[PDB]
Design a protein around this ligand. Sequence first.
Ligand SMILES: [Ca+2]
Ligand SMILES: [Ca+2]
Lengths: 236, 236
Amino acid sequence: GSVREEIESLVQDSLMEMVKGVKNTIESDLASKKGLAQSTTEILQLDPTNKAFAKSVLESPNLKGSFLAIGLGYESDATVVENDDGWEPNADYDPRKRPWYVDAKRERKLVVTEPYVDISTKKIIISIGTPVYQQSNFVGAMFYDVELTQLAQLVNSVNLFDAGYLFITTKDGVTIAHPNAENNGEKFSQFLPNVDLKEGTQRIELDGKYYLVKFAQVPSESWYIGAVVDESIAFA
Amino acid sequence: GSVREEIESLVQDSLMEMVKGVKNTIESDLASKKGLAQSTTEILQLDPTNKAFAKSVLESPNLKGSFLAIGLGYESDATVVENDDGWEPNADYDPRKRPWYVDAKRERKLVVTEPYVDISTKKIIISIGTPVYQQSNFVGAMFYDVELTQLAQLVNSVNLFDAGYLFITTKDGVTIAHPNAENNGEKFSQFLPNVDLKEGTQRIELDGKYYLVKFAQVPSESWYIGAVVDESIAFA
Ligand SMILES: [Ca+2]
Ligand SMILES: [Ca+2]
């Protein structure tokens, strides 16, 4: 009777502690990626039209090792410098048309894109985009690609194993990271039907098993971190 | 009787959860600082003897805003490029003698120094030091200074207010960060006597008040994060 509610207290408190820990992990990874992007862009702005300098920066190992891919597209001749070993842009690739470029140019600051199809890996990715200025003139934009399987591994750092999993969506419920990447770029409702996108805990039924969904928001980009938990397994 | 031990359980579990949260904060800040240092050094290694290029990089706003001060000392002519607005090196300043330089040269990789007296701010600081190479030749070293009051504010992010505080020491018990900076660079025993430096919880007496000390280690640099908690206030 009162133990039921005591147990419920323990369960909800531990879910929220688990999710906030994961939320801090995501915030920390994002902030450090943004800081790197911001500094790299500022450094390239010392001589932005110097393609040889730009390539050298993007090929430097720590930076190259921090993102799936990095590149700079130019507003003038639609050319692109990038550090993707296994990709060279087609004759009809135009960076100015790409969402990282459009977002960065529109907002005139560092942006994180919505999920979109990568030209190189043909997968859903997200990118950090930044504008590049030559003494107050916009001369192009940069992308810093983020691999989403890696992001999914990160939110599932804590290992819920067979008890459940964590995922990430945008503010509009579009999936950013999930153990099955096939969900990425789609509305999260396709693997969690009739679940509202809001902070807090929801209890749902399928079969005659109960599941707990906990959402928490990442303020910087308004992402939602979600956890799905099998009660029977997680609290046996 | 059994409630006493139940209460003890709650207290110890919540202390450890508080400290591990703070430990992750420190680890995340350090890793992002190290990543920035590593990339900045690699970028400067594109043309390390170019003092004008080097200065331009160190003056770029995101990087300049991420550390108290940044500089590069050269092995050849003992000259130094730095971004400290309120400091210019004396005629007898020799970077090659400084602990960030000696540590970086000795270890041939990114290092975090022991606490030491800053030449510029005349305060105890720590630095990230990195070696600089010109095609496999050592041409000098860099410092990335870390202000310790800022570090103390960070470990005390969570606000224990009048219930207590957190601090940081090296593996040898030398204080790195404390609400009173006067403790920095000294053995922590001067504000916590008869307390062993080890992971776990210790209960101590002064007057007839009880205090809880919890230590947790930061693996990367073997720092210890400590929390001192007034039981009477924190668990009233
Ligand atoms: Ca390529
Ligand atoms: Ca100066």
